[PDB]
Design a protein around this nucleic acid. Structure first.
Lengths: 174, 42, 662, 140, 232
RNA sequence: AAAUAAGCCAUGCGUCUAAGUAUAAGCAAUUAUACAGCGAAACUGCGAAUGGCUCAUUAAAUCAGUUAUCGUUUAUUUGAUAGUACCUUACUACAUGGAUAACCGUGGUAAUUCUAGAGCUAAUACAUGCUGAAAAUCCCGACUUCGGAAGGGAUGUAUUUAUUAGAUUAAAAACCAAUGCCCUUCGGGGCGGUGAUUCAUAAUAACUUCUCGAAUCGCACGGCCUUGGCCGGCGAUGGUUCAUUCAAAUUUCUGCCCUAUCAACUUUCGACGGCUGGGUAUUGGCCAGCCGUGGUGACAACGGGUAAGGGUUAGGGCUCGGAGAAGGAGCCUGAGAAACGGCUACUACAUCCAAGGAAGGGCAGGCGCGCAAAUUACCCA
């Protein structure tokens, strides 16, 4: 019953239309994957052209990019903080794209003290924004999801830094 | 206003005569209304 | 082997202990070959972390198993993502306390090894092998991963890692079978170059002959001829040596190291980056010599033992580089000029300062495509420091030549701080000489840099002698070129310029009729020609002022409101036809001024004056002039009627010119 | 709401703005060059590419969240009358905030990928005219 | 399985081959710009009689198309494919005529050895390498760095390499392979850009007829230099 | 050569080439015996997006011209194509695994492979896959006798994400006024593509319960001579990416017949946006959260009527042109189907039986009064 056609809706002039044709396999839309936090549960879907897309339903870890310094590490996922679209995804902990979620900080902290050497969160090129330093002292950073978990099979993304970090802290306070 | 958010009280056609009301209550209706009075307030 | 590891783990679980009991499911999935990378981040950073009570029970078993998985060659791919990321993902998640047992299972025979004794070198140990040349390579790759993942936390494990890396390094350096020893050498040198800036406080003084045998024996008599192509691991090691304050006393052990390092700079066929790399090694040495009390423990050693006997060869190589080739990169130019900047306050006496001053004025008469203006300010700082050495009294033709350059860069620069330091280099010029006169120029340009009240005071005091005048003329045409703060500065500069040319027309004695007249040609006339195109109308007014003063006062020199404007243009028309004119004057002064008159009956009167002047200029200038006017057609859609009226007048002048020249 | 962004440009570095030209003999307005609004259906800010048909016309209703409707008039040839008749159509186009918007002006639009059910066009050039309301007619 | 009238008008069939017509198999040249090998052998050349006779020719290694043995019967051979038959010792070439139909041209090995192919596109392939796509769907790795779009190339056909190229030029004679003025050998004398889709060229014949054809439908054949022998 | 039915009644109904696997207890043999020729059975790969049937209809939504994919998928075709070793097993490893079918036997039931138990054996079926070796392979190259090279850096691909490069300099204060400067004999001489993209492509950091980088088959069989081999050619099959072909999907402007006893219509399955995600092969109110106030219409929306052409130009001719497989509902394969080919449940008919159970859902033909009228023809040539 779930489809992608426009034959049920009214026209631009405000008119409905009969226009009865059967639902076809190129108007096919499948059921949504509310990717949640758990161990890895991915089902592989074959699609047109025989092409596989990986419907991930429960995910644990993904790699996140602390890319201003030049690293990305595979870290776990604690719980979704906020979602711009819906509140029910925040309630039932659903990993979608553009979700701000808090992740672990241990490999980023390890790489900081491994490359620079000055410890963090416990000369001048090692420099950390003090809000992000508070996230490191908490041991739980605020990442954002840039990969589609439903249509790739992984929840990866970049960490929030600077203006976006402060914006989503203010949005959490909202 | 939008998709479902307002309770449009319309009598639904196929949803009209599903189930018969089956009164399964082991208490005799004279002791039950005396019960709801004597909660934490009374 | 994965099968033998599985059977061994089954026997370890047959040992039934409660430390291993809650972790068995997490253990066996590491040997299941499909779930290793997921099970690693299930084990560490999970809800079922290793409890520190029975951490003492599980960790030897777990680390032997993770070691075997890091060894195994079967399931891993090629490249880095095959097994290099696996070793990195084990060691990045391991603790620094478990890392001791990890390196304990890593180093089998080299666990209890000693490289250095109370004496220098243990030749009894070094003339024996405990490991195959196949096997040391994985050891060195693993320790490279351990050090790169640990960082500073190597400090409790200093006593064995350096013995391992030094043993493999000197066995390779004895073995110069080639390929395995070569890779052993290179990756051990990378590991050491990381380990040095990993460990600052560790004592490196009980061994010096080991660095001696690693450096002086194979390379140094051929090192620039080798390093002409690209940067190497020995250079990567000497870099962090120059960076570390306690490691720069390793460069003094052989006296010829820094000679070969600047001989690398001397070799001109190098591909620019080994040159800037040796340049950076020198930057770090001079910064360490300039550093406070931290680096003052070895400051005197590097001052009296390294740089002091090789200042001359350093300046000779930098001189040969800067005067030799026709193509010099901007990165090498800026970096080498910054090295001379930082190296000038370190030398008190030297030998080739005459050369270095001539080099600085050569690089300051260089054009702007080759040399940046920020680089010109750095060569200015070079001038400021090198000038105070007692050298300008002999070779006076050099001293007049650098003074021609200090004057020439006064109108060039646009920065306040650069003009401050310009006033300073002229101050020490004045302290070194004539002396009263250059001190007068000093106080003049000093209160020129000084704010508006002191500036107008400077202008008035200079308003109230050739080499006296020339820098004042350069800075004065610069102060013409400033449009307005209040508009007063350009007027004062114009009045000072009128005072100058009044002094020039006051001097009409013949051996100065040569010099002052050549000056007022070459400095003042192209300045007025270039300032004719200045869009500021007050700047055009003041250039009109000084040019009218020049025509009124000069004439024996051979090379020379609306209604009033139209009247003066008609008088210029009549003056043209009565006397044709000088063609460079016509091309480079009057046409852009009248163009500006159009583009700010004024327009038709202006086109009449250009149609007059087109008869008086020459066709070789007229060719590119006409091409610029069609460029105005295609580039300017804003005043089409004006540009096309101008074109019609000019082609009527064209037909007039050809009909006359028939 | 989420923080709007140009999708692949690294702002938070401690060591710009991406604007492409549409082409087709057009010039980028100064608000599209430097003006700090962010819109992904903008052909100068977002990734929307203009190709195909190039149309003009006069706006009916500017008062809408970045979407204007154009009344396009033309002269149809009825063969029964053997005559020309006026026929008006209504297009929809997504509006960048780069330009200065007026009512009754003649606006150039360009064809892009489908941005909504109606929106297939973006504004590219506005000609500021003193055109009037629905009573005004001109084939354009 | 199309009918004989729904078959295109440029590979001819008479009132003879039944009501049906073979469809070309999928391959290098297009569908509507095509001559199948069975129509070339038994309907144009008449070296055969029937489908089974054409199969008995094709299945044994006796027909080579563009220097390689082509086995299947309905193999597409649209434009300028040299067709070498060794038992007859002939090489045919496919050109057009002035009316808009296919034409066959007998030739020997010296002009049979090379193919003049029009470049469809130039790109950077995988490995960071420029590659070149012609209208025969031949991709040439590492081409000459001036051979841009709409340039033609003398392909070696024994190694497949580039030998020479002819640039798109106003003043170079060209052949039309499409449109309402199809098959008219004349000289490109003008070219109009029309940026925004579907640019044109203005082209005249040897005897002064100007007409506008699209730069897709053009095909460069040589400035004067008839590098393939157009039939005299 | 023209030739109403509703209801009754019988009859009719895949795939093998030299080139994957042969111990058929299968045939046919001999001059060097694993196999060799033919080869049923079976495993493996391909095939069936149609040939054509029925009937409530589709009123610029289909359709036609005309665009675009810089918004997408594509088996097959044909063309190019893949530099990716070492990296603590060494007191090592170096002719890779196990399943089954066919087959052989023992049966159950009324009930055909409806199938149970027991014993085998192959793959181009499914599956793993450090190694002879101190080298390999890319970029640089000093020195140079074309010498060919001392020694320096480095180690694929597919997915997903972050970042950088996507190209002379950005102190871009450059290049542009070569309108010069010098010599001269005054004639002169010298000083990637696109309209456009974050496109194509390259690299770093990682990520995948992630793929590919040939453990295959046939035919010829040649050079070096460590006579123990090392090299060697032509094809078939298979493989990553980019093409190309064949398609499919959307998509832009114009064009339907009539009617005002049709003037308001849409928001009554969201009606118009924009933001965010989900799902799709991709865009998109297509769908879900947040808000804004819309959108069409007397230039004829909307509603109503049902009577559902284009190109080729002497002409006529010729060419092209929704819903269902007993009824709803859900699922499976494949490059392409919402196949109706199968399954499941419910509903409705109906068949065999040993009364426990088990398989199945078309058209054509004749009668359609008791009296009537065109072959149940032959073949893929």
């Amino acid at each position: 019953g779930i489809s992608r056609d426009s034959r049920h809706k009214r026209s631009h002039t405000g008119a409905k239309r009969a226009f009865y044709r059967k639902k076809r396999a190129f108007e096919l839309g499948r059921q949504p994957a509310n990717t949640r936090i758990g161990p890895k549960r991915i089902h592989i879907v074959r699609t047109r052209g025989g092409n596989h897309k990986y419907r991930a339903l429960r995910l644990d870890s993904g790699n996140f990019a602390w890319g201003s310094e030049g690293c990305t590490r595979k870290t776990r996922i604690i719980g979704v903080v906020y979602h711009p679209s819906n509140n029910e995804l925040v309630r039932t902990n659903t990993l979608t794209k553009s979700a701000v979620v808090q992740i672990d900080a241990a490999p980023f902290r390890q790489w900081y003290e491994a490359h620079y050497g000055q410890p963090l969160g416990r000369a001048a090129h090692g420099k950390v924004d003090p809000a992000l330093e508070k996230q490191f002292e908490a041991g739980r950073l605020y990442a954002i999801i840039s990969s589609r978990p439903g249509q790739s099979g992984r929840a990866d993304g970049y960490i929030l830094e600077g203006e976006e970090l402060a914006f989503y802290q203010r949005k959490l306070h909202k | 206003a939008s998709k479902g958010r307002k309770l449009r009280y319309t009598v639904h056609e196929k949803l009209q005569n599903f189930m018969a009301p089956e009164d399964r209550r082991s208490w005799e209706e004279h002791a039950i209304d005396r019960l709801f009075g004597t909660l934490f307030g009374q | 082997d994965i099968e033998l590891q599985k059977l061994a783990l089954k026997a370890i679980l047959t040992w039934k202990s409660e430390g291993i009991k809650p972790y068995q499911e997490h253990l066996e999935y590491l040997l299941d070959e499909a779930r290793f990378k997921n099970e690693l981040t299930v084990l560490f950073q999970g809800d079922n972390k290793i409890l520190p009570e029975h951490r003492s029970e599980v960790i030897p078993v777990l680390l032997h198993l993770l070691y075997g998985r890091a060894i195994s060659r079967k399931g891993a791919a090629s490249g880095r993502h095959g097994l290099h990321a696996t070793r990195l993902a084990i060691i990045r998640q391991l603790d620094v306390e478990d890392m001791g047992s990890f390196l304990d299972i890593g180093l089998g025979p080299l666990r209890a090894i000693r490289v250095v004794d109370e004496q220098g070198v243990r030749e009894s140990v070094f003339a024996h092998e405990p490991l195959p040349p196949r096997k040391q390579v994985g050891l060195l790759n693993m320790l490279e991963a351990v050090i790169n993942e640990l960082g500073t936390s190597v400090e409790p494990y200093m006593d064995a890692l350096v013995n391992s890396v030094l043993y493999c390094l000197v066995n390779a350096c004895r073995k110069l079978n080639e390929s395995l020893y070569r890779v052993i050498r290179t990756t051990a040198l990378k590991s050491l170059s990381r380990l040095f800036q990993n460990a600052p406080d560790f004592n490196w003084v009980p061994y010096r002959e080991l660095m001696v045998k690693e450096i002086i024996s194979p390379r140094i008599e051929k090192l620039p001829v080798e390093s002409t192509q690209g940067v190497s691991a020995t250079w990567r090691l000497m870099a962090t040596w120059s960076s570390l304050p306690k490691a720069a006393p390793f460069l003094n052990v052989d006296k010829r190291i820094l000679p070969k390092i600047v001989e690398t700079l001397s070799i001109e066929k190098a591909k620019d980056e080994v040159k800037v790399f040796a340049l950076d090694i020198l930057k770090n040495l001079i910064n360490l010599a300039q550093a406070p009390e931290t680096e003052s423990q070895f400051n005197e050693l590097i001052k009296t033992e390294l740089l002091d006997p090789n200042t001359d060869l350093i300046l000779k190589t930098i001189g040969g580089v800067l005067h030799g080739q026709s193509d010099i990169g901007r990165e090498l130019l800026s970096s080498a000029v910054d090295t001379v900047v930082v190296f000038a306050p370190m030398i008190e006496v030297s030998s080739h300062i005459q050369d270095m001053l001539e080099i600085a004025t050569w690089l300051l008469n260089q054009p702007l495509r080759k040399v940046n203006p920020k680089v010109k300010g750095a060569i200015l700082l070079i001038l400021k420091r090198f000038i105070e050495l007692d050298d300008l009294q002999s070779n006076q033709e050099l001293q007049r030549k650098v003074y021609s350059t200090i004057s020439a860069l006064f109108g060039f620069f646009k920065d306040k701080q650069n003009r401050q330091t310009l006033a300073e280099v002229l101050d020490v010029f004045a302290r070194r000489e004539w002396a009263q006169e250059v001190s007068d120029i000093c106080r003049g340009l000093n209160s020129y840099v000084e704010d508006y009240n002191t500036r107008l005071a400077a202008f008035n005091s200079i308003t109230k002698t050739l080499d006296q005048w020339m820098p004042l003329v350069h800075n004065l045409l610069y102060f013409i070129q400033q449009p307005e703060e209040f508009g007063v500065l350009s007027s004062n500069s114009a009045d000072g310029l009128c005072k100058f040319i009044s002094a020039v027309e006051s001097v009409w004695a013949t051996p100065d009729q040569a010099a002052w007249i050549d000056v007022v040609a070459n400095i003042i006339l192209p300045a007025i020609y270039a300032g004719s195109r200045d869009p500021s109308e007050t700047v055009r007014r003041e250039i009109l002022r000084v040019f009218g003063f020049l025509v009124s006062h000069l004439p024996q020199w051979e090379l020379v409101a609306v209604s009033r404007q139209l009247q003066a243009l008609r008088v210029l028309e009549a003056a043209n036809d009565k006397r044709e004119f000088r063609s460079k004057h016509i091309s480079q002064f009057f046409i852009p001024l009248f163009e500006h008159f159009i583009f700010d009956g004024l327009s038709a009167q202006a086109t009449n004056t250009i149609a007059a002047l087109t008869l008086s200029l020459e066709w070789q200038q007229y060719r590119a002039i006409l091409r610029r006017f069609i460029s105005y057609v295609e580039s300017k859609p804003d005043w089409q009627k004006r540009v096309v009226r101008l074109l019609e007048k000019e082609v009527d002048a064209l037909r007039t010119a050809v009909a006359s020249k028939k | 709401r989420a923080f709007l962004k140009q999708p692949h440009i690294f702002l938070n570095s401690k060591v710009r703005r991406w604007y492409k030209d549409v082409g087709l003999g057009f010039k980028t307005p100064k608000t599209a060059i430097e003006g700090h609004y962010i819109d992904k259906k903008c052909p100068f800010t977002g990734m929307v590419s203009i190709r195909g048909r190039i149309l003009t016309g006069r706006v009916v209703s500017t008062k809408m969240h970045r979407t204007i409707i154009i009344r396009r008039e033309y002269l149809h040839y009825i063969p029964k009358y053997n005559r020309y008749e006026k026929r008006h159509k209504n297009l929809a186009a997504h509006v960048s905030p780069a330009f200065r918007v007026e009512e009754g002006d003649m606006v150039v639009v360009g064809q892009c990928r489908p941005l909504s059910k109606t929106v297939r066009f973006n504004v590219l050039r506005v000609l500021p005219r003193t055109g009037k309301s629905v009573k005004k007619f001109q084939k354009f | 399985h199309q009918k004989r009238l729904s078959a295109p008008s440029h590979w001819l069939l008479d009132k003879l081959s039944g009501a049906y017509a073979p469809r070309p198999s999928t391959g290098p040249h297009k569908l509507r710009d095509c001559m199948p090998l069975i129509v070339f052998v038994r309907n144009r050349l008449k070296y055969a009689l029937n489908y089974r006779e054409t199969k008995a020719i094709m299945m044994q290694r006796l027909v080579k198309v563009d220097g390689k043995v082509r086995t299947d019967i309905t193999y597409p051979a649209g434009f300028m494919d040299v067709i070498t038959i060794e038992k007859t010792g002939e090489n045919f070439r496919l050109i057009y005529d002035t009316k808009g139909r296919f034409t066959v041209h007998r030739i020997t090995d010296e002009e049979a050895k090379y193919k003049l192919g029009k470049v469809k596109r130039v790109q950077l392939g995988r490995g960071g390498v420029p590659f070149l796509v012609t209208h025969d769907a031949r991709t040439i790795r590492y081409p000459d760095p001036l051979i841009k779009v709409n340039d033609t190339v003398k392909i070696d056909l024994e190694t497949g390499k580039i030998t020479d190229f002819i640039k798109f030029d106003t003043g170079a004679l060209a052949m039309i392979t499409g449109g309402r003025n199809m098959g008219r050998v004349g000289v490109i004398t003008h070219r109009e850009r029309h940026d925004g889709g579907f640019g044109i060229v203005h082209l005249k014949d040897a005897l002064d007829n100007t007409f506008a054809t699209r730069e897709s439908n053009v095909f460069v054949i040589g400035s004067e230099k008839p590098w393939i022998s157009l039939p005299k």
